[PDB]
Amino acid sequence: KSFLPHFIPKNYSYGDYPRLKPENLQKR
Amino acid sequence: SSAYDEALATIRNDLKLNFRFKADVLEKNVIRSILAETKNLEIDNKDKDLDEFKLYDLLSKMIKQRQDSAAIYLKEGSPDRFRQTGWNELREVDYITKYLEALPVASAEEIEAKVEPIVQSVLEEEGELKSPKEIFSRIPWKVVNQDWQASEGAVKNTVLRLYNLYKTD
Amino acid sequence: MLVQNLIIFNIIGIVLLVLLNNNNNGILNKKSLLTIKNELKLKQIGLIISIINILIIIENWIGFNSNYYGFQNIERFLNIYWGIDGISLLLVLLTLILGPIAILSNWKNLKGYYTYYVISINMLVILMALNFICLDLVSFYILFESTLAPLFLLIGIYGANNKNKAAYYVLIYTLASSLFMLLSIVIYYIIINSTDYIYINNIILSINLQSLLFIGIIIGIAVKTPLMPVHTWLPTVHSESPLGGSILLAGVILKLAIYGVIRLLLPNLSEISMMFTPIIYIISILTLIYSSLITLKQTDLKVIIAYSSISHLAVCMIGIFANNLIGINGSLILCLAHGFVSPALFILVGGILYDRYHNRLINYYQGLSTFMPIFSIYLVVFSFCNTGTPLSGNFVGEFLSITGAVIRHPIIGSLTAASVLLSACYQMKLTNRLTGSVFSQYLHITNDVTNREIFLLNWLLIPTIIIGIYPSFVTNILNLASSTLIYSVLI
Amino acid sequence: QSASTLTKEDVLTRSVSVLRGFEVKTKDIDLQTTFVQDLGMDSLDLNDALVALEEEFDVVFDDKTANEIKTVGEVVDFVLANYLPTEQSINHTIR
Amino acid sequence: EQFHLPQPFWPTTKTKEGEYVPKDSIREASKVFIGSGVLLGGMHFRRLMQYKKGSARPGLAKYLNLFSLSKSQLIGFPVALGAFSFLSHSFANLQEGQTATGEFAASSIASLIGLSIFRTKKPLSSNVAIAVGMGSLFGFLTWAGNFNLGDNSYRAALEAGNGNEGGFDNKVIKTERQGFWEGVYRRPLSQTVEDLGEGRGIITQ
Amino acid sequence: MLFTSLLLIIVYGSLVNKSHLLTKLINRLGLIIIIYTLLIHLNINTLENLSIGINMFNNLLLINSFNNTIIELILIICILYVLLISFNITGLSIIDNLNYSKRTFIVIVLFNIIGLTLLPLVNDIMILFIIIELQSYSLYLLTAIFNESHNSTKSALYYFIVGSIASFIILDATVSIYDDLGLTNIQYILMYIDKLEIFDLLCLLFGLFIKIGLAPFYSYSITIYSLSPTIITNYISLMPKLSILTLIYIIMHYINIVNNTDLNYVISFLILISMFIGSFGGLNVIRIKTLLAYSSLLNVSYMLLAILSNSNESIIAYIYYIIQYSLTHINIFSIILVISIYLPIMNNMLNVMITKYSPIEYINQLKNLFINNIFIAIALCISIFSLIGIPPLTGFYGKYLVLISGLNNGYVLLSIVLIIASSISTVYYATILKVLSFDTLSFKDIISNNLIINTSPENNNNEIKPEISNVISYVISSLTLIILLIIIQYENIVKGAYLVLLYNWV
Ligand SMILES: CCCCCCCCCCCCCCCCCC(=O)OC[C@H](COP(=O)(O)OCCN)OC(=O)CCCCCCCCCCCCCCCCC
Ligand SMILES: CCCCCCCCCCCCCCCCCC(=O)OC[C@H](COP(=O)(O)OCCN)OC(=O)CCCCCCCCCCCCCCCCC
Ligand SMILES: CCCCCCCCCCCCCCCCCC(=O)OC[C@H](COP(=O)(O)OCCN)OC(=O)CCCCCCCCCCCCCCCCC
Ligand SMILES: CCCCCCCCCCCC(=O)OC[C@H](COP(=O)(O)OCC[N+](C)(C)C)OC(=O)CCCCCCCCCCC
């Protein structure tokens, strides 16, 4: 149905920066 | 208990080398302290065999105890005249971590490489994350010794660390 | 007359400001009278000194002959020969014009110590201006590196939150790289016994020795333009340095690298410069393309402008290493046009928005045209100048630089035309956002551009358009000076 | 050299072992563990323990502190704050 | 036709073809390997005597721990130095002389061999990172002419008349190429074509 | 004059009663003695007459125009140092009384000045050994002048042991040469320069390298300079280098006759290591004197490159560099002694203990100097920028002249390494400047009445009371402006260094 754009990592690790599922705000 | 007995041999050997070559005094206190807690550990786990994972949680407690003591001293000051008590706590943590990382168990990245797919899969099926208790359920706390090669507690720390990253409230 | 008066007068100005403002340090605990209104009188004296320095170069400009080949106003002072040609004359005037602008941009946005800042600004301007009128390699290096001492302290005292990081970066990136340029200067003084411009221009060295000397000098030049991959100091220094420090860094300091090519490479190492041009073009083209794509992902307003400066100075490097008059003139005009537009964009981004909201994150600003229409006009106008829209000196510089590259190397010089597209991609992505959508929810409505900030923007825009429409004001002066740099034997 | 290398966990651990060799009611000793109540030491037993804890850590309790000591944690606090390594000869350090 | 790239290389004496008797690589490496193992092993057992003589003195013990070598370092160091000597001489024989590329290869391989012995408990990529760094340093050392240019220095050239003591004269033109440290007023145009080639303004357009 | 006046001062000091004023006035007599020594030496020794080289005292000594310049430099710097003990450095008795509590302070200095000036003149192996002991013994006695200080005595023990090992190495080298040739006079030994083992002279240089703190023997000097009182560290870290380096230059002048490139390589190895240690060593340090100890090790490596190249360009480089570095060394230590007056007082974490010998011991005790005294802070910035080598300060021309001599002799590697070493050491030079000034605006409006200077009283509340004493202020002003404005007279000064000859002639 609705899918994320390309080149969006499924995981990341930047120290203590909060880890969250990428939400494309254009679809809100 | 093959790995446990081999591990405790290196700790004993480093004690023999330390007395032989007059190495750092604080290291002598660390090894002597480890052996005493090992002495307590043997008494309370007889006939149950001693895997290195139960040794892993013993050194984990020592590391966590001194970090808590170091935190207070490095904030309100060490009580000795030379103000070295707080740094002595952290110096011992390095010695204990040297033996902890030599045990044949998973590193922090291997355990995170297995829990992170579980933490993410919980949040996507439910929307919001409130407590780690919903992530402990999807963890097989029966067979994480040879498929994951980790203790009972090292998985607990990995989840709690990952939960604080992923929590939405 | 020029150098002697420009140094003696400014020393008297430096001593005068010190005498007035430091006469009351001795446990007087008084209230003084020059400390009122943020040291208004001491600021005004330094502002006047900057304008008078522009009058000194004018008196020597009236007697300048555009139809004379060679250095003019040849003078001896402090056992050093000082002279001017067409190329040097324009860069001196550009350097001195930005002096009053640097002081006025920080007229009321310093936490204190206004006398120190004004002295350092006037001290930076003169040292940079004197670097265009020296006539030997050692005097070039002395003035090239003397600016590091005041610039290091200027950033560390008047800088932003990460000023400590920025002060170390500028001191270590530039000093370490210039010491490699000093090695080449020492070699010249050893084998030729002189570093005079005219003396060394006539000597042909062995093609192997010319390679070693070129690499030593190019290391110092490449870091200071800057070029990839030694450019990482500039974005950090620009985002933390004060507004006047960014204006001088973006207006004069980077242009010394192009003048270094004109003096230290083209006339003395002519044979080896032709060998190195493909390497120079590859490095510069990738500097242009990479910096433009990197600028897209930036989130700091003053860092976006800093990366924009790197893209255009790669084009200046491409033009100056073309072996034709079109490219050389185009690179010089682009240096002057950049010397006005780039400081203007720092005033808009780091001098007006920052003085009101004290935050350089891009996410806080949008729809500024609703309550800041005057700011939006200047922001939009300078954005099109920055992308080389015709009627601006930037386009005339960019078009001739691209044309000079195509004439020099038709295949690879054609990649320089990506400046037209890529510069508009990141510059109009930032401007379309600041002037787009509803006025930001994170901002409170405040004053628009004041009279002082209008004055700064107008007098940086005016020279850009005068040069853009009638560049012959500049090309007439540069014509005979630039023609001496071309190396070719057609048979 | 002339500075302490003591941690709160080592001093407590060495204190417990020295107190374990006595005739105490319980072997479960922590900082809050009192001498009179938990371990059950009369006037003379307590001072035997204090001197035993003196020899282990090479410290000497002052009279005011020793008469007023109640808990095991107070001893650990005293050792950490007052312990100093003994001075060595002029040759041990520089050679 | 070959590309015309700049050649930033310091002057060196070039052995004539047929010269350069090669050096025995195995024999030379044997002396470095054996002599180093004897010293390092001998100094190891000498320090054990100092341990036995005194172990209750912290001052002596601290200094002995700094110079103490682990067992894998007592074997790895002679092997790395022996491999370095062998590979440096072996590559020099291959190239009829010593080059910076040969020294870069010899030093990095010798470092990686030693690192894989006395740095076993570190990631492989970490050992390669050090070996590349170590190899570059010795390649730079050779590129700069070892500790001194010697007979190729300008002072040496100035004493042999190959400098610029007499000055310059444009009327004099030399078919042969000028010396490394020599400067001239005017050059044969054939030399420029040899250096730059024809094209973008040389001879043709 | 030195010898005659020393005997009178020795006896006079033991005759009069002991008081701080009398010791201070006796120090001023020492100042007059050195001034008369300089005037007498200038009146009789001239560069033009000594160019050939004149033998004295049965050829035991040999003075030439190269030796003579260093002797005058030693006398001039010794004059500036005695002003520190002959006048008020701070004006507060708790700090200044230390410089007046030892009556033998001036006597030891006059003993050492005699050893410093005679050492470059040595022309015989027997007198080389005697003088190098005379210089070394006085340095040990000066390092231990404060015998009630535990650190001062500990440094003197370390100094004695290391400096005796070097002296034995020096003696062992001369005995080997005498065994080879059966000759003791240097000029006689020069007749057999091609037949004696030249590495017997490298052993002689190795003992000299220990006494200047060159790597790998740098450890003891870094330790000693940090533990000694700031007034002692100012002298012992600079004075031995003026004489020993000059002697090393003369020895290397004789060594270059036979052109042994193997010997040149060993010295280049020591210079290369010293650049690495001098630059990387100072990056992680918190003490200012430990930082300056590495700075001294680094600047010695720069001079030894000029000494190693040993040509006509090397005489100019070494002579100019040693003069300008001595003035920078004097200027920095003068400021460090003065600025103890701006130290905050308690009324605590890390239990930091500061003693009367070294009130300024850590780099962060220089905090807010830009606020407390802007003119002195700028003077310290100018000196530090000179060590960095920022043109057109004196330190720039020193590095420029060293590079010319080094690159002229084919030392490509060492010229590149020092320029990398200069960049690395800039990191810890900049850290001084960061501490001085970088927190000016975020601290400008603060109330600081807890400084050491605030303990001083006030005379009438209607007079103007200068915060720094007259002599020490004028010296700092003079040296700082010389460092800053050397461009005015650089051409004339370098023409003078052209005339200083060491058997060049023609
Ligand atoms: C936002 C910032 C505010 C500023 C924005 C506006 C900027 C000002 C616009 C003008 C820019 C300055 C350029 C004009 C200056 C005069 C140039 C000049 O000297 O012209 C000389 C010209 C030929 O020279 P000559 O034959 O030698 O005779 C004169 C001898 N001294 O002799 C002549 O014939 C003079 C002819 C002058 C014609 C008027 C020029 C004014 C501009 C109109 C034309 C612009 C080009 C057309 C563009 C239209 C759009 C495509
Ligand atoms: C009966 C047996 C008697 C044995 C007497 C020796 C005692 C044991 C010591 C072990 C041997 C090492 C010393 C050997 C002599 C000193 C080196 C020397 O002079 O060269 C001899 C040897 C062979 O070289 P060769 O070509 O034959 O000699 C020149 C002939 N024209 O050249 C060599 O290859 C020697 C090997 C040297 C290479 C290893 C040393 C470098 C690595 C260890 C460094 C030691 C610590 C660093 C010291 C410097 C610190 C700043
Ligand atoms: C046979 C005995 C061993 C040989 C010792 C040689 C001593 C003289 C050599 C000159 C070096 C003088 C520096 C002081 C000597 C060091 C004393 C020492 O050996 O201690 C080892 C020291 C401690 O290291 P650590 O591993 O923590 O302790 C061992 C734990 N078991 O580890 C160190 O830090 C030693 C390294 C000190 C820094 C020296 C670096 C000099 C510059 C080398 C690179 C040159 C740069 C140019 C490179 C380009 C050319 C290729
Ligand atoms: C063209 C060559 C010129 C050379 C002379 C340089 C200026 C000398 C200043 C000495 C007097 C002084 O320290 O005075 C201090 C003044 C003004 O400070 P203020 O705000 O009044 O102080 C505060 C007093 N309150 C609190 C009462 C307001 O600071 C200056 O002037 C700074 C200029 C120098 C900065 C760069 C240093 C670089 C060093 C190396 C250079 C290569």
Question: Overview of this structure, please?
Answer:
The PDB classes it as membrane protein. Keywords: NADH:ubiquinone oxidoreductase nanodisc membrane protein complex, membrane protein. The entry is titled "Closed state with NUQM and without flavoprotein (classification state 2) of Pichia pastoris mitochondrial complex I in cMSP26 nanodiscs". Chain A: NIAM (ASHI) subunit of mitochondrial NADH:ubiquinone oxidoreductase (Complex I). The structure is cut from a larger assembly and holds chains A (28 residues), B (169 residues), C (491 residues), D (95 residues), E (205 residues) and F (506 residues). Chain A is largely without helices or strands and 28 residues long. Chain A contains no helices and no strands. Chain C has a two-stranded antiparallel sheet with strand order 1-2. Chain C is built from 20 helices and 4 strands. Chain C is globular, with a radius of gyration of 22 Å. With 506 residues, chain F is mainly alpha-helical. Helix content of chain F is 66%, strand content 1%. Chain F has a two-stranded antiparallel ribbon with strand order 1-2. The longest helix of chain F has 32 residues, at 150-181. The radius of gyration of chain F is 23 Å and the shape is globular. Chains in contact: A-B, B-D, B-E, B-F, C-E, C-F, D-E, E-F. The C-E interface holds C 190-193, 202-212, 214-215, 271-272, 274-276, 279, 323, 408-409, 487-491 and E 4-11, 154, 163-164, 168, 177-187, 189, 192, 195-196, 200-205. One 1,2-Distearoyl-sn-glycerophosphoethanolamine (3PE) binds next to helix 19 of chain C.
Task: Reconstruct the topology from this structure.
This is part of a larger assembly, with chains A (28 residues), B (169 residues), C (491 residues), D (95 residues), E (205 residues) and F (506 residues).
Chain B lengths: L1 H20 L3 H20 L7 H25 L8 H16 L7 H19 L6 H5 L14 H15 L3
Helix pairs in contact in B: 1-2, 2-3, 2-4, 3-4, 5-7
Chain C lengths: L1 H20 L14 H26 L10 E6 L2 E5 L1 H20 L8 H17 L6 H10 L1 H11 L4 H29 L5 H5 L2 E2 L1 H18 L8 H8 L2 H11 L1 H11 L4 H27 L4 H20 L4 H33 L15 H14 L6 H16 L9 H17 L16 H19 L2 H11 L6 E2 L1
Antiparallel strand pairs in C: 1-2
Chain D lengths: L7 H13 L14 H5 L3 H15 L5 H5 L4 H11 L7 H4 L2
